[PDB]
Nucleic acid binder design. Structure first.
Length: 251
RNA sequence: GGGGAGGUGGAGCACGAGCGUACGCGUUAGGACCCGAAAGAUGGUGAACUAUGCUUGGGCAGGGCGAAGCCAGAGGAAACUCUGGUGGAGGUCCGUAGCGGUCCUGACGUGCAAAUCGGUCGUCCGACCUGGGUAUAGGGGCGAAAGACUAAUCGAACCAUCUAGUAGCUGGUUCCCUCCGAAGUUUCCCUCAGGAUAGCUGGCGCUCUCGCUACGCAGUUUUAUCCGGUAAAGCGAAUGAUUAGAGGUCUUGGGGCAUCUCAACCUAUUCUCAAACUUUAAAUGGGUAAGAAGCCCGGCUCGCUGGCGUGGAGCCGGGCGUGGAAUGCGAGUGCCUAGUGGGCCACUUUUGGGAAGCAGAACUGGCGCUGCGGGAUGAACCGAACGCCGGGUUAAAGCGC
RNA sequence: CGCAGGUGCAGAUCUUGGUGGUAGUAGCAAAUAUUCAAACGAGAACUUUGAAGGCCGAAGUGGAGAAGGGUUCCAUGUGAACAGCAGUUGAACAUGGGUCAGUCGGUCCUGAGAGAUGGGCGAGUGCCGUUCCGAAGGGACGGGCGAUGGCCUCCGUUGC
RNA sequence: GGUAACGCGACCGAUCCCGGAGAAGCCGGCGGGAGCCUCGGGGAGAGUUCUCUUUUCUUUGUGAAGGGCAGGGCGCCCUGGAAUGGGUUCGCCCCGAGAGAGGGGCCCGUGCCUUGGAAAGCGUCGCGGUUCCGGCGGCGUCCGGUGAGCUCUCGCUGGCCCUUGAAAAUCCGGGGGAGAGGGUGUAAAUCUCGCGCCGGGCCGUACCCAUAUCCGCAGCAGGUCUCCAAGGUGAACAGCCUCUGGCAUGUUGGAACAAUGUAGGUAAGGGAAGUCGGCAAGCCGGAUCCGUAACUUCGGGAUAAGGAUUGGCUCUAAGGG
RNA sequence: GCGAAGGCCCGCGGCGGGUGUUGACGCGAUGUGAUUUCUGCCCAGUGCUCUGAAUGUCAAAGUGAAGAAAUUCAAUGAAGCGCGGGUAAACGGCGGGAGUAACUAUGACUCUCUUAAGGUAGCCAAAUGCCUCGUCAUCUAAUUAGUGACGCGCAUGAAUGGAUGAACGAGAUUCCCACUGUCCCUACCUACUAUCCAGCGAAACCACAGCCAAGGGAACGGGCUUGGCGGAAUCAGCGGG
RNA sequence: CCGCCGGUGAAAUACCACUACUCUCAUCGUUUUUUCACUGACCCGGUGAGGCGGGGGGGCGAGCCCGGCUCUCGCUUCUGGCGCCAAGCGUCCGUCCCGGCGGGCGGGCGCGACCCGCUCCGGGGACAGUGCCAGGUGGGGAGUUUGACCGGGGCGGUACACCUGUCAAACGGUAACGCAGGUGUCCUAAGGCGAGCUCAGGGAGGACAGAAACCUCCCGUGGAGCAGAAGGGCAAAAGCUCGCUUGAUCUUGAUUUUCAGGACGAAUACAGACCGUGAAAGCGGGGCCUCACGAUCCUUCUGACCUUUUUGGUUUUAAGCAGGAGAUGUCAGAAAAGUUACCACAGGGAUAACUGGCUUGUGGCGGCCAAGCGUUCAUAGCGACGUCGCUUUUUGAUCCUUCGAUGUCGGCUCUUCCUAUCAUUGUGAAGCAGAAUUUACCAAGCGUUGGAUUGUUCACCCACUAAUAGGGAACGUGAGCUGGGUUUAGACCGUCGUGAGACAGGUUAGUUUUACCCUACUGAUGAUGUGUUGUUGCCAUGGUAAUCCUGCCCAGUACGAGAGGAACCGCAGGUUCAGACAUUUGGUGUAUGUGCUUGGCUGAGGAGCCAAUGGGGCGAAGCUACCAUCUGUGGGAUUAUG
């Protein structure tokens, strides 16, 4: 047989991301002396739209503490921030929507977004529109903090991780039905070449394990093991269960 | 460590025949008699078509419907409703340019054209059409998915090489005359369109034999002597099959009523039968013998056998040619060996099948390999087989034209 | 007389070349259309001029460009071959000639992307990689410290 | 200099820092300007005149770059304080965060006049030399009106997007004030102001751009990216006829008018009886006025279905600046 | 499925690449296919997936023992299988056999077998029904066609999606009005051919060739046998050979 | 007294030392493991590697003790401003000036801006990761395979290795997917020997006892048994019952069967050993005889005072020699699943799917006999039980022709032929009164229709009709059409399959090429001859054509009880076909004839033109329609019959 559609994606030729009109990597500022000990004041200059990304981005201008120059950062816009607002980054920053604070100084129940997975990153978790993480508890002896992620999972991170107070702007985007093949087309024209999805049962057996037959049927169980080769791992990969759920399933 | 006797296994010995060289034929390994695959592999070249993503440009009359928002009026008691305008939404409708390609299964169909032409058709603000520039390259790409497209090539492109790839399969295989002359059958084989094997053929010889100025043999008969269970015949003979009367009677029999008839059994007869039945039993078959390798005398050897001068076998001398049926004929023997290993027809016999110019056997002859006279014509029938000719005569068949 | 062959063809839908019958046959039928007179000329249905009749009917059968072509452009001459009839004609053949820029483009900039060095990988030609594992500046206001040249009291050029 | 918006011909200044321009989608609706078309007159030339037509046809300029003035736009300024709310657009929309009213400021100015400029170009009437003199000369190149008209362009203002519609060279403005200049000369540093002097090298440039210069073996009914775009009819870049321009019927002609064919028509009376099947053809068709069902996701179905009218000529009424 | 020392994937190779200028309202992998109304039962089988291990099997390496060593033996012995779990909008599957309600025919309520459940709601001679042109009705004069019904349905059936349904369709089908050369049944007209001429000028194909009947023959002859017969050179058509 | 002597302690015990199955405690013992911490290898992230860890010093405070002691903190949180390139101090210079110090001019350094400490900061970390080996999983990928025979292949069978009877034609041999059957074993005896008996069945008797219990006599040629199927063989046997045994053992050759006169299997006579049995002669090296089985290579066991183990020697190991065993059943012995409708190549008429040819079971159509049917009566008309044929418009059977191709179902169109005759002409017979009908003869001249459904042939119905007969011609006819069906590639459903995919099931869409050659045929010129040429004519020979029905009258007549109900002559017409023809009606119409009319154009009128025939009305001539009209015929010899 020939290599299959999922295999062809990793080559990254026609399936690469469309990044011509994107505004840059949305991320926090690099940790420094001011954010480690006190705070630093920046100003929101514009709220801009990033193609392929539902969440709006905020352009925040800071002032360099070592030479005469103004810095420009691209943040994930917490819902509520506005142009002309002053945002504060540091361990002494107050608990306000839009500020960047270590999760250790945050109280329990605080809602955060653009959370660092490991200290010194620039925001890695809870970055999509309408998403947030919650601080559950701290452990000042080991300098660890538990956080609930938007998937429902629970994670122990370092308390020096930083985050933005609030939720990511643009929530409810999935509530409106797309309603149109064309609107789906325009949605993925800004992201990557993945949208019009042909079914494997509609293919020939040479391009998919589910192809062929005089009827349009899978012919073999669609639940596949984790160790299956690349051209075989199609269907439901390592499914712990199948069918309609009755309740909430979590680890 | 070396000897003996008696059996068996050896490509051995037993007064060498080989080596070198040339030629011919045969079997192979090699391109391997010549031409022929579908494939496989290794390195390369293509996205000037087309598929998809990206960058930068360009393009899309005129009409219909009339979403939201806004204005005014009428209400009603209010609720809120109704009316007339304005407005210009939409993967909205008609329909140009453009893009596409339904039906006529129209034209053309050695065309204008290796896919075009006409009328009629679908869409025509969108998932729209399009130029250039870019990216993805062959078990790879790309695919709103047809195994589609990837330079008229796609169920793995094209180029060169490995490569004169292999082929039990198809086609072809070049001068003359002379002589000899087949097989389609046996056994083994993933053997059934092929081989190996025996058989049939040819060539080279060789060992002898007869005769003039016989070593022996035979697709024949006869004379002796065995072998057989087919044709026939048989069932008052065995095993099976089977028809009808008759004469008797024990009846763990029945029926109609002291019973009496049936049935049963027995006995003697009677009709009809057998590839897998038989007492009997042909015709045509098959084997052996018809002398000198025989016959008859005398002696010797033996470890075998043994009452014995026994028996059996072997060996050494001697004698006997009326050459011990007919007919015909010169025999024996070695090496090498090609083609063939699809058969078919007829008298008789014969299996399956209603049968067949059907399928399968036996014997002999024939066609195939073969022409000639006759059957008008015809592979096989009847007659007869062939160097080039003259005379004569026939066969089978004929003699109205 | 001997020696040695790439030594004899009717076939192989054999190979190369040549030639027939078909056959003066099929055909020279897509988009309405030509006529009169004259000129040159050996020669005119087809060239040129004039006069008529028609067509494209501005999303043209018009006027200009991009690709691509490469002299096909222009003048003169020829009528051998070619332009599937002719031809006095041609995008044919021959002889000459023709493309002039500071202000129109290229040239410059980056885009999608392509691609070296450092580094890494790799038997290897090489490949991955484009900021990532680099001591990646060769410049400049200005100041100072010296040489040098000038319309040299002074200024400028050149090294640290 | 101006209360201000900003203005004037210049109006010093480095490292450094901030910003702007280059630099942004598609669709709709209005308005301004130009080109084209149109209408009424005046010139010059031409056509028709059998009868009429004071007619019909052609033609009737002012480049860039400066200067001035219209005109368009403005979330620019000053006075002032609005409800009995007012202003205003086709739509909207705007106002105590300052409406209306009045007065200013700026930007664009492709329009008009002007320098260029009539000396040139065109039209027409004549006179020369000789193949060419940009020969010479006379007269003219005028005055108006219209518009949802078409095209281009400049603006304003909206709609749509889970789509938000490049980057870099290059150029400019501002913040700061390290520095420089001269002591009162008729002076200095400095000047993005006016004029004057010198230079701008290399490559491309002819022509075809397609029913004959390109690809399809060819002068091949195929294919191949764009720009400009008159009159009439009419909704129209539809189809039909015409002007500017172009052409010679698409690699030949003459004669005839047979069959069969290809393409285009018509047909009495029936009206799908043909055929697998109404295939093919035919019916209907535009606009105006009426009238429109089942069903329905309430949007539609819908040009449902069905009916009437439609020419020419002569009038009337209404709709504006 | 995945919280990034990750999921999916590329690559001969480098903690090299794509998604990713990304972070669960995201990326990747599948199935079904608007809206409406529903989506029944089965985890035995095959997959996928979780850990309790009572824990059995279980290589290399390591450990110990015997022998002079090569060797041999023993214990130990990871994942996987086994073992117990989930799970069908995973692949799929959804039967009979009995026991029986006052004419029948039909026949709930009870129990059992394989290999777990026995086909629920709906729907149907359907694009799915062999028998079959099923039976009834309607459509016509006449209907193997159409439609509506019926239910033991060879072999319907519920995201291998069931049922339905406005709007839409160069999709398949039946009937009706209108209209007609589709037809009865053909005819006439027009242009371009074909035609003839001047000029130019191919190709396919070709053992030899070319009149029949019967015969026999490789069983359907142009040739052979026996009969019928046979007269130069050609033109336009034609489709038997 | 503790003590075997005492449950007559099953020995069980005082005295002693050992180990035996379990538990616990430990070991500076051995090894293997689990957890926590460290950093330094190794990894990840951030940054322009910009302030890390301690010690401070002063200031902001909080507490505590009577100035300390401990701790905190690092100067920025109303405004959509500004922020760098040091101020200020404290010192050191001038080759510089003006009065050692001062002033001016130009400079330097330190603090402002603390010191020290080894990794820039943070997060992991001896894990992850990498290299090498080992086990699992792995159609993601690669390579390959997927028997043969066969009245085509497949499905089915095994006729593939063996045995019995028959075929088989009286030696032997002899084929078919011929017939009837058996085999892949079974046996320590069912092998070997000896002895002694006689079996199946039947008759007659005997308590329970009977058709079958056991006892006795008699008859018994085997009619029983001998294990496997069948055939042969066998009676003081080879059968039954006992007794003893292992000749079913160890060896070398020869031979038979199949056969090539290789092998294997099986078998036959000997020979040399060692044994069994019996008194002995003898018999016995498996089964009474003909079936019951297996190469090389590899493995495994057994045998020898065996041979090699590579410089020699000893010992393990290994190799060899000989005989058994582990197996190939496709049985002379490869290691092996499917699909292809997306397909490919070499071939085959050695072989299927058409026609044709043989055959005719089946289909269809006839005939003979006569049991019955027909009120009566075998035969008007039929015809049982039987029996003989014909035909090739059914389907089979076969495989001769064609696989370097003979285009394939049906319909449409068109011609000709056959008769086994539906009608019509002429007849014969009847259970023929008339009418209607049935049976048969000559006979194929003429005719045999319009439609609904279906792709259909076939069928069925509706309706006319004289009748609505059956067939052939390569199952006539595709360079004649059509393409509905069947028969490619797209797609859907059901069932089957794990799947790829299959369906002799349904459904929908799906390119129909070439004639100009020869002949045939249709027409058209022409040809040889009569000296040339023309006119008028004759005829050989070939073709051939007419067909059927109404109404009136006969006549409400014959016939018949009635009901009903004809026919010949004659008259008037019509159907189908054929040959012509336009006077008339209709069609056509570009006479481009004459009006009308739209758009445009020639200045307008008049007159015209263009729009591939602009459109439309009416139209001459011509052509043409059962859509008008006209015409269509006589004898001869005879068939069946009388």
């Amino acid at each position: 047989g020939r290599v299959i559609r999922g295999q062809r994606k990793g080559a990254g030729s026609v399936f690469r991301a469309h990044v011509k009109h994107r505004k840059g990597a949305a991320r926090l500022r690099a940790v420094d002396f001011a954010e480690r000990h006190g705070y630093i004041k920046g100003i929101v200059k514009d709220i801009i739209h990033d193609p392929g990304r539902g969440a709006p981005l905020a352009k925040v201008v800071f002032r360099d503490p070592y030479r005469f120059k103004k810095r420009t950062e691209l943040f994930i816009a917490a819902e509520g921030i506005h142009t002309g607002q002053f945002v504060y980054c540091g361990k002494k920053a107050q608990l306000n929507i839009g500020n960047v604070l270590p999760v250790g100084t945050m109280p329990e129940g605080t809602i955060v977004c653009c959370l660092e997975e490991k200290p010194g990153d620039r925001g890695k978790l809870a970055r999509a529109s309408g998403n947030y993480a919650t601080v559950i508890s701290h452990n000042p002896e080991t300098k660890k903090t538990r956080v609930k992620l938007p998937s429902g999972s629970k994670k122990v991170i370092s308390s020096a991780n930083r985050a933005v107070v609030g939720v990511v702007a643009g929530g409810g985007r999935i509530d409106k039905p797309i309603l149109k093949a064309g609107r789906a087309y325009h949605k993925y024209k800004a992201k990557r070449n993945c949208w019009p999805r042909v079914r494997g049962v509609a293919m020939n057996p040479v391009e998919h394990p589910f192809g062929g037959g005089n009827h349009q049927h899978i012919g073999k169980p669609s639940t596949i093991r984790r160790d299956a080769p690349a051209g075989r791992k199609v269907g439901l990969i390592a499914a712990r269960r199948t069918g309609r759920l009755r309740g909430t399933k979590t680890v």
